[PDB]
Design an enzyme around this catalytic site. Structure first.
Site, PDB file in Angstrom:
ATOM      1  N   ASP A  35       0.834  -1.203   0.000  1.00 46.75           N
ATOM      2  CA  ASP A  35       0.000   0.000   0.000  1.00 46.75           C
ATOM      3  C   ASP A  35       0.871   1.255   0.000  1.00 46.75           C
ATOM      4  O   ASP A  35       1.345   1.678   1.059  1.00 46.75           O
ATOM      5  CB  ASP A  35      -0.904  -0.008   1.229  1.00 46.75           C
ATOM      6  CG  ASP A  35      -1.819   1.204   1.304  1.00 46.75           C
ATOM      7  OD1 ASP A  35      -1.911   1.937   0.295  1.00 46.75           O
ATOM      8  OD2 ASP A  35      -2.422   1.418   2.391  1.00 46.75           O
ATOM      9  N   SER A 199      -0.578  15.551 -12.208  1.00 49.90           N
ATOM     10  CA  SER A 199      -0.833  15.199 -13.594  1.00 49.90           C
ATOM     11  C   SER A 199      -1.074  16.457 -14.420  1.00 49.90           C
ATOM     12  O   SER A 199      -1.599  17.460 -13.932  1.00 49.90           O
ATOM     13  CB  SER A 199      -2.042  14.263 -13.663  1.00 49.90           C
ATOM     14  OG  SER A 199      -2.442  13.997 -14.995  1.00 49.90           O
TER      15      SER A 199
END
Length: 330
Positions: A35, A199
């Site tokens: 994770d 992004s």
């Protein structure tokens, strides 16, 4: 040193991935959920409330000659899906894919919430976010990657998650046969303890690319892709019959649909998520309403590039002095 381990989907939907991990002496092998959105290595154990164990493999520290109680240390964690766990702490030897750390903090669960009990395939979590998020008190502990870093050939790990197939976590090296083209690297902020990056925009299907900054985290422990409501609305508007359902808890779509792809930007490069990766199947057994793999982050407080996005790429978690993330097509 290096390590290399295969990671395997837990079910036919890729809801999560499990990777075998050796703990203790002699080794006890547990299947953990790696994770990159958390920083605790915790396991079902011989200390876990018996009624809260249902099929998981447990760590028994009393059977490990290298286990030592970390006296006075406790831990307690709550995840973004509302699940939680807590307990005490041992140090022990932990190996992943041939890479060994001695003295790793192994957090032994005394209590776990219902969603963990109900998932017999996940024996615990291995956190790979920054150690500043580790919950051990009163002495915070380091992640497996942080403890291994100095010994690694290169201070990196890579995630290569499969679509409906096994994939690989590598530690200490970049397998240049595992991706196509070049790897595009992008800046990371560690201020929230996550692999947080920006992004450069998105496209829906064959549509034109929209240049827009989207800050979010690379999180292997989250199944879906959670993005701003504007972006998610633009995606699902291209799917006839798709709608946001408050009763179901997100966007659903007719199971008869063919989904468009979704592209996200990494600098000047582009990662394409095929439409099929966005199908999470019937909302309940036998239903013709299917659950979408792109959902709004509006109720989270952060955008999350979960497995839906990451499994479309070969992803480098670069833990150099200034960390960065790399993405390649594959």
């Amino acid at each position: 040193s290096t390590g290399s381990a295969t990671t395997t989907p837990i079910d036919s939907l890729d809801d999560a991935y499990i990777t075998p991990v050796q703990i203790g002496t002699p080794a006890q092998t547990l299947n953990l959920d790696f994770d990159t959105g958390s920083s605790d290595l915790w396991v079902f154990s011989s200390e876990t409330t018996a009624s809260e164990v249902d099929g998981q493999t447990i760590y028994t520290p009393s059977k490990s000659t290298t286990a030592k109680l970390l006296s006075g240390a406790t831990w307690s964690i709550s995840y973004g899906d509302g699940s939680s766990s807590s307990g005490d702490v041992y140090t022990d030897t932990v190996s992943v894919g041939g890479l060994t750390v001695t003295g790793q903090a192994v957090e032994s669960a005394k209590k776990v919430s219902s969603s963990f009990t109900e998932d017999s395939t996940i024996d615990g979590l291995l956190g790979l976010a920054f150690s500043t998020l580790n919950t051990v008190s009163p002495t915070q502990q380091k992640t497996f990657f942080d403890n291994a870093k100095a010994s690694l050939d290169s201070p990196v790990f890579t995630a290569d998650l499969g679509y409906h197939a096994p994939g690989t976590y590598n530690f200490g090296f970049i397998d240049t046969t595992a991706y196509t083209g070049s790897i595009t690297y992008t800046a990371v902020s560690t201020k929230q303890g996550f692999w947080e990056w920006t992004s450069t925009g998105y496209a829906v299907g064959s549509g034109t690319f929209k240049s827009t900054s989207i800050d979010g985290i690379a999180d292997t422990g989250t199944t879906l892709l959670y993005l701003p409501a504007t972006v998610v609305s633009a995606y699902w508007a291209q799917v006839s019959g798709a709608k946001s359902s408050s009763s179901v808890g997100g966007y659903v779509f007719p199971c008869s649909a063919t989904l468009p792809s979704f592209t996200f930007g990494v600098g000047s490069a582009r990662i394409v998520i095929p439409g099929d990766y966005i199908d999470f199947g019937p909302i309940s057994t036998g239903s013709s309403s299917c659950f979408g793999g792109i959902q709004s982050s509006a109720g989270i407080g952060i955008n999350i590039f979960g497995d839906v996005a990451l499994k479309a790429a070969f992803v480098v978690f670069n833990g150099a002095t200034t960390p960065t993330l790399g993405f390649a097509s594959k």
